[model samples]
Target: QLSDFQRNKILRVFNTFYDCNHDGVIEWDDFELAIKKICNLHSWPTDGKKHNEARADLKLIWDGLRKYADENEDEQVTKEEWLKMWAECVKSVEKGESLPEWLTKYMNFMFDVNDTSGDNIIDKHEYSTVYMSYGIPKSDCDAAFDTLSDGGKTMVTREIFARLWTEYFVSNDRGAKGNHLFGTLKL
Candidate 1:
């Protein structure tokens, strides 16, 4: 179970990442900006299947957030709402419950973002970009990928990655392989 401190730390980083426009609120366009930023940072082609896939993923998350988190129906998510929703999610996990719909969709979006090759698997190179986005070093990301891939393969299927992704968020163990997936967590 995550302590309140850890949960707050995660919430800070979560808000930092999603508030792409730094407008103090999360809206549909913030998600778009985040996708575009990731694509540009990685130099992924913007005019192909990858772009379409990324946009689709964004729409899924946007729709989920609108349906689940936009309680005010204002088409925008204030920082308080976002933090409250995420704090509840962490509490649910602490109680051994399943993830909420919005979180599930957000993870799917993250998977799509990291799978730059259009394949369902995330290769070491692709995973490195994901880690770098979180401020992790490339060498640490490579090491983490190697460990997660069982020291042989250099890629992980979406299913495996998804499981690890969940673990990364909820697990308290410092040595967990999933903890290395994104390297050092930052806010």
Candidate 2:
């Protein structure tokens, strides 16, 4: 929930980046530019740098925005369309939906890759493979799993999945509200 002033400020920032020709409307390319700016502002690495994970970050925002912005058959997004999508972006963050969305998507990928037994849940062996693929150290995984139920055969429950997801995932409160981050940092 933002005050009118706050919302206007956000719209200004987004429009500044998205309005490439200053016509006050945004298209797909403008949206891409805005997302790139966001990545730059966050100091996210680009290219082949070790921490160059901005593309992954961008994909998340882009995918979410598409669901909201491309609602009609029209390809171009009017100011109103942009505003609506921007509002949804802020709302999703406020609702803390990002982490779960990221985690669930990751889990689905892992399940597809390692669910050899075809069960919905991952057993210890399958879990180990999936966890390692996510770059989790075996020792850390072991330590985290130690607190599980009596036997080590416990599957990856939703609770456990969230814990693991948040451990390596990155998020910030500063970027959720509006374009304050972009305005200040020119990312």
Candidate 3:
């Protein structure tokens, strides 16, 4: 089972990122709306390759969410449904198993989204773009990146990004920068 800390981070993602429409449930439309915003942000034409890939990837992301969380076949995930899934979902995860497929896709998706330059690295501006897109202030994004990137000395290649993703989910240390990898967090 996940601890209170883990639940809080997960809930933070639920309340902000996944529910893009700010609606009560995770729905397919939320993905579309969010994807659209990101696409528009980058000036990616709707018919472009990057946008296409993003759409397809988001579809699978939604697929994974529904498969794991939508227990009633309603095609949506309420807060209860989402939290219920995580209870058992993160059990073996604590024992150090690799993240499941859907989670992996999610990790990759975040990495890809942040690497806006199509490079395999996440630099400060790239990192800031993502959190800012999700409504985090520029100053907060700057502060988070400084810590996460080790004062801009560390380069976040894809491999490093994967490692950080694991740390964010599994580490309980409140002092860790991984805890703030997503965006704004609370005590």
Candidate 4:
């Protein structure tokens, strides 16, 4: 529920990056570039720091965008696709959307507190330190981790991450950059 001013501000940011040619609307390359820039800004590691890690993260995003992108697999993502993808993510977080609601809430709370930089994404230190400090009962943490690590990967899969992102970072309707979950449900 962003105010008009806030929405416009977000639109401006999105447009500035997406409209690479300076035209009003975005095409495929512009959208791809914008996504890459946003990912980098959020912690995808530009400048060759942990390059492999960064590529892995980017690949996850690429997979997600492709999964939701329109037919013909036109790398071109329309504004509607972008917005709807986010909106669906928001929806996924409102109810008991994923496994182990208690763990989700716990992780989300930690993420909110430790994400001190307000970058909307967490770095390794931020993610690890917060959980360590809380000492939130290793059993519970392990349960959550196991649930998320469906393929024995011991890490969040794309589906799990999407829900976490919505729950932890995007549930508030403050503005364009603000996350807001529309329905009434407790985490």
Instruction: State which candidate has the highest lDDT.
Output: 3
All candidates' TM-scores? Answer: 0.74, 0.37, 0.92, 0.37
Predicted candidate 4 versus true structure: per-residue lDDT over 126-151, tens digit per residue? 44444443333444444444443442
Off by over 4 Å in 1: 41-49, 94-96, 133-135, 150-155, 185-187
Once superposed on the true structure, which residue ranges of model 3 sit more than 4 Å away at CA? 184-187
Summing lDDT over every window of 10 consecutive residues in candidate 1, give the lowest-scoring window: 178-187
Per-residue CA lDDT of model 2 for 1-187, tens digit only, reads 4556446655664455346556676566664564455444334455644224434554564465455576674656576776666566556655775643533554443334445466555455655554444345666444444433224555555554444334222223333311221112122
lDDT by residue (tens digit), candidate 3, 1-187: 6688988887878887889988779999999898898887788888799888988998998898799889999899999998888776667677667766777898898898889888898888888878888888888788777777888688888887887777777777888778878763554
Which should have the higher lDDT, number 1 or number 3? 3
The positional error of residue 55 in candidate 1, measured at the CA in angstroms, is: 2.4
Clashes of each: 0, 2, 0, 2
Q: Native-vs-model 1 lDDT? A: 0.73
For model 2, what is the error of residue 32's alpha carbon versus the real structure, in angstroms, after optimal superposition?
Answer: 8.7
Model 4 TM-score is 0.37
Which residue segments of model 4 deviate by more than 4 Å? 1-49, 98-169, 172-187
| lDDT, each prediction | 0.73, 0.47, 0.82, 0.43
